[PDB]
Symmetry: D2
Subunit: 319 residues, 4 copies
């Protein structure tokens, strides 16, 4: 049977005999993603260039996600890459869920038409206190659901829950996300490594060693290929589909990495683990870091389990 | 005033007082590109998954059929076809078109940016058309460019008048002129190549890359980007400046990318925008091909960056 | 706050504390209507004319049929396109019965006339093995009904116990946007709608009523006339602007022409939930007890003052 | 071979060996029609209803701006503008365009079919451009037609070569030629007018309509259709044959529809398709206008039906 994201989520909700709140949240999120996708592909750009005689895409995308989530009545605390403090849903619209999201990841270079994406992680509120920013300071282990939308050659929604990872293709002719890849698992070992090698002068020695081994294998195996889009959603999705490893590690100038834990690293780590992959800071699983600031950064190395394990050995070899 | 690709091409054609043949060719290609874009964004994919109870082939078929029916072409060379296609006499025009209909498609399973690359030559002789009519150096190009199917779809068209960039508005199926007479930065800060082949790198490439990470003039090290889809990496080079490299390695001693419908169109776009494109030994556009599918090494982009590579290259003789 | 059909239906279901089965049905139907709309607007027609070198009513039927079966919410399906009721296979059976016209008005789609999808939704009432008889319930038993109009824009009108709500399809995002809430028809309109080409066959009551619209005996202004000849388009105008719509019996159609199960009953339900009326002349459309799934009925529907004025003329002629 | 409106128009222009000015006009109008269709189908309406927290004026702006920026027009007359619009000198071309940007829009609240109607003239004098350049009889038309925004969007284009119908494919923004050199039936079976105004009918209209419903012989009575949107009713008349009437009466001795941008374009399409269009007194196309907004009675459609109406009409004259 054909399956849509709408039908899939609804049926998962009936199996769990839930109240319908999480289904409303996800339906609302899916609608924002379709609207973001439409704007990213530049529908209506003729009007901006005067065909009949405005907001940047990252601002518009943040507005789309914020309003659809607020009006879902399913959320109470919202953290966005775009906002310094967490948004507290007003009382009449409050639900039980906390959502951390990056509304248009990779948009800083969208002038070159690079792939971009939306990343989200969804938690249930743990305290009975009045909702506050503190409710977003949970470890990734507490995620109820996470995933991303990739606006690439086509638009795809990847949704991870306890049931596994499922991939839905947006058919723009009808505005429906079509389930095309069920219960996805990552390869045990890949053949692609992904990081910005231009910063080689600042690499940690374990990172230097690991990359040198990918290019000059000591066991006479074939050297890995290299890919680095520079858009996390695009690089991470390719890692899921083809296997391999993705690194944005800590270094001398950036002991905490550059990517953001709450709405970049935690969702991608959760997608990876539900797909049989791994995601580490070097010191521990990304999902086990207990955050103290909603915008705090984290190092991240993620992907096929054999590859992440090989990186960790090199990291531990350097103490 | 707003400008469309259709209106722009028509008006250029009226300026040259041409017969309208090239305008018809370019119009047909523009239609093919919009149809490819629609398929790449997966419009109608629900029908494939049973709602009512191949992409590189379709892309080739779209370009082939639109160019044939334009009545403007006589010889068509595609990455997909072993031999050149000869247009039947009743639909034969005077132009020769080399194209890559869905460049980067080998990895489209991960939704990487993909694109269509095309180069257009005029056939001058009165001989019966043949594959040999496509064996021209890039210097002979009448027009070239690409369509990038990335976060949005854009057509970049280079001609004698320069380089112009048109954004596809999917709401009305119109390419809107958004960047006129584009020129590349004199010098950039991003280098682009597959460093997985480092063990097989030519000594000049190894040193040049070392200069990007550890600059000799105490400048900041370049960032690295490599999408692995030639159209995406080359378009970023155009917009942000910098350098793109696909040099020879052990698996590809003449490089990997194809001269006729990958390197030459991109070399032409680069040169019309104030950039450079070299094999190391000569300008790509000066290579005289002997095989429609022959490969070439290519280093292209901002002029200061390519000149810096060439200095390193000449240092290794 | 902005509201979508998906969000609207889900919230009604949470208020009713239902199992989610009817929401699954409606979501599936909403998906089919968007696919029908895309095909009706001729997306992809360039491929049919050879750009790379099913009939619309059949495709529309297949879209509705397959989306409803795979919803797991239906057991019996009646369509204008199928001679007999479709019985949903045992593993996919739900509790609802759906009668629908997948592309109403398609006989003149050659001139690009507005066309539409009409549907009526019942709960299966008998405990017998599902059969064509499960669709022979009077319209009074409808749980939900409505239509999609593929006109200048695509609109879905959904009527339920909570009232009538209208959603505009935004094709940029494949989303039905709530634009008119808890809609009510005007008490009295100024437009009458029927095929006057059958004037020679009209019964005396229709002849008099139409004469009153053109030459009003109180010397008020004559009604204007509109007749698209596509029921969804004419009924939708009647809902939005008021007035009256008539397709009475004639010599070629002595039992009327429109179909009771999936044209007259869904439109009667929308009209009554919007404060309007729908009569055969002898009784409310919704009270007719069907005996055959494709049976026809005469229908007079629209603003309550207008239908009541017609019924007075009808009783005057006995 | 597949054919698009863009390719079709270009080829007609190459056969006529023209300067390309009329082709640029038609391309610009086609683009405006795709943008009108997108707004009429309500693309982007979610933003208007607050997803991120007028139509006839927009349609008029779209046509006006695309025609102005074509450099092919000098005088523009629209149903939406009180006076003729004079194109600024630097953008002036040789054509005069009369149009209704969104005919039928007054009832667009009910999602009734709507349309754009246009007629294109060559400027006849060398005088400074003015409203007077639009006061030509329909006989002087170079091109006319309409776009119907119905169940699908179709552009009907009438020229000296005949009437051709192009279906808009929204997936790629291309008008695809689907019905070539179309001719209307000699005689139809449908009559189309607002019978709610029966008490004010001219006696000839009363008798003629009564004959359609109660034929004096053994023929079948005609069916009746009246959408109330001229483009929708005229297009059905073209496809199915029959007759469409908006005739004169004592209270409206000149009819209601407008000669320059409703009656004349539809008359030209009908006559090129082998049909007829009369005021009752003369051919619509032979009326010489004195006012850009003047009205004209119009009876049009299959020639046997129009002649029969004139027989009844002259009996009461
Ligand atoms: O989805 C959840 N539950 C199923 C949704 C049903 C609730 C709403 N009820 C109805 O709609 N009823 S009805 O009969 O159709 C009806 C009644 C009246 C009018 C109408 Cl129109 C329709 N739960 S959950 O927590 O979100 C969840 C849990 C686990 C995983 C996931 Cl992914 C989500
Ligand atoms: O495009 C070129 N020339 C433009 C001239 C258009 C030819 C078509 N003629 C008309 O359209 N005539 S008309 O009056 O409008 C007319 C008349 C009757 C009916 C109709 Cl419907 C229309 N030349 S070129 O070599 O292709 C070229 C050269 C350089 C760069 C480029 Cl990019 C292309």
């Amino acid at each position: 049977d054909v399956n849509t994201l709408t039908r899939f989520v609804m049926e998962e909700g009936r199996k769990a005999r839930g109240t319908g709140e999480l289904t409303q949240l996800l339906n609302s999120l899916c609608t924002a993603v379709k609207a973001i996708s439409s704007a990213v592909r530049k529908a209506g750009i003729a009007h901006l260039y005067g065909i009949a005689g405005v907001k940047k895409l990252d601002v518009l995308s943040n507005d789309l996600v914020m309003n659809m989530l607020k009006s879902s009545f399913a959320t109470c605390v919202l953290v966005s890459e775009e906002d310094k403090h967490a948004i507290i849903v007003e009382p009449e619209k409050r639900g039980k869920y906390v959502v951390c999201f990056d509304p248009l990841d990779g948009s800083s270079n969208i002038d070159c038409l690079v792939s971009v994406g939306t990343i989200f992680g969804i938690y249930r509120k743990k305290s009975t206190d009045e909702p506050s920013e503190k409710d977003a300071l949970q470890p990734g282990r507490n995620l109820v659901a996470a995933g991303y939308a990739l606006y690439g050659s086509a638009t795809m929604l990847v949704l991870a829950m306890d049931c596994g990872v499922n991939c839905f293709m947006l058919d723009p002719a009808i505005g429906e996300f079509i389930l095309v890849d069920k219960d996805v698992k990552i390869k045990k070992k890949g053949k692609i490594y992904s990081l910005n090698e231009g910063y080689a002068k600042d690499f940690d020695p374990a990172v230097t060693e690991y990359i040198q081994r990918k290019k000059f294998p000591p066991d006479n195996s074939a050297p890995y290929g290299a890919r680095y889009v520079g858009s996390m959603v695009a690089d991470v999705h390719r890692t899921l589909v083809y296997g391999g490893i993705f690194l944005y590690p800590a270094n001398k100038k950036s002991p905490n990495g550059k990517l953001r834990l709450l709405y970049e690293c935690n969702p991608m780590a959760y997608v990876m683990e539900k797909a049989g992959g791994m995601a580490t800071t070097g010191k521990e699983a990304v999902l086990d870091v207990i955050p103290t600031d909603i915008h705090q950064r984290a190092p991240v190395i993620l992907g096929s389990p054999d590859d992440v394990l090989e990186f960790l050995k090199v990291y531990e070899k350097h103490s």
